[PDB]
């Protein structure tokens, strides 16, 4: 089963981005955070997997600058999966 990734944020006018990823059939994956399609610029706090019997789902939280958000820079959460050899991603556009 390929993983399913979604990214949510508190909004309410730095803002945290919480990337929720589930569906890991072999229970192994890693998550990269990108800004405007370029990775390696953001560092997130990576939580351990919940180890649910259905799948070892997990999430991560990153503090992204309020100014970039107000300027309309998009962010994305990309999940790499070494055992299924796939990539899944989600994109947050925000609002200028």
């Amino acid at each position, epitope marked *: 089963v390929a993983p399913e990734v979604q990214v949510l944020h508190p909004s309410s006018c730095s803002v945290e981005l919480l990337c929720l990823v589930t569906g890991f059939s072999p229970a192994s994956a890693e998550v990269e955070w990108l800004v405007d399609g370029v990775g*390696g610029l953001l560092v997130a706090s990576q939580s351990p997997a919940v180890r649910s019997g259905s799948t070892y789902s997990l999430s991560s939280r990153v503090n992204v600058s309020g100014t970039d958000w107000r300027e309309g820079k998009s962010y994305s959460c990309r999940v790499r999966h070494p055992a299924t050899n796939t990539v899944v991603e989600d994109h947050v556009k925000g609002c200028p």
Partner: antibody
Amino acid sequence: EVQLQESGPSLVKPSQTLSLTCSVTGASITSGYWNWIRKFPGNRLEYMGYISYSGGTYYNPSLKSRISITRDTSKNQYYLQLNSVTTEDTATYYCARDFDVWGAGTTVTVSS
Amino acid sequence: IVMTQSQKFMSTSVGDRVSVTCKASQNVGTNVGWFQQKPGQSPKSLIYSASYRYSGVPDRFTGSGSGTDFTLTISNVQSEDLAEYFCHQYYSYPLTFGSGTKLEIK
């Protein structure tokens, strides 16, 4: 602002180990994903392999066994070693970050 | 994974809107991007995901996502826009590229 520069021999003999080294000019080899891709003269490309910033690699099955990819540490460089080469392996080799910046590329000839 | 780009040597005049497309047997979804390869220069990653612009990419070049038959249109072609363009898969760790297209300014 983060460039890649290919480096290696211009010619390798048949059935001789070929090794190319990616020189990273910025950012860090400890963040993101790095790879090796090559373009063949007949306007076709294939992906040769993946390097994780945390260690560990993935290889394209079409390059199975002959391909060995590793990474250095303090020098911010990676290298690709092929332990078997033929004339069909002459190609332009590129170093790249996954889905981001590509290097200029270098051409390697496999011939006597 | 496979790619098909059944287009070659397409021409455009200055100011025209010229498009390039790519197809694959896999539906892929929003797991593509595109390259611009100018001879003498390093290729640049130009289109991010199904449709976006990497920082520094001009707005005049707009993509369109799909589940098959992914496209791009260059609006208001001006100068120094002739390059080989390639469709790039993100769907799986094995990657494939099409043979690309060449643009003419006639």
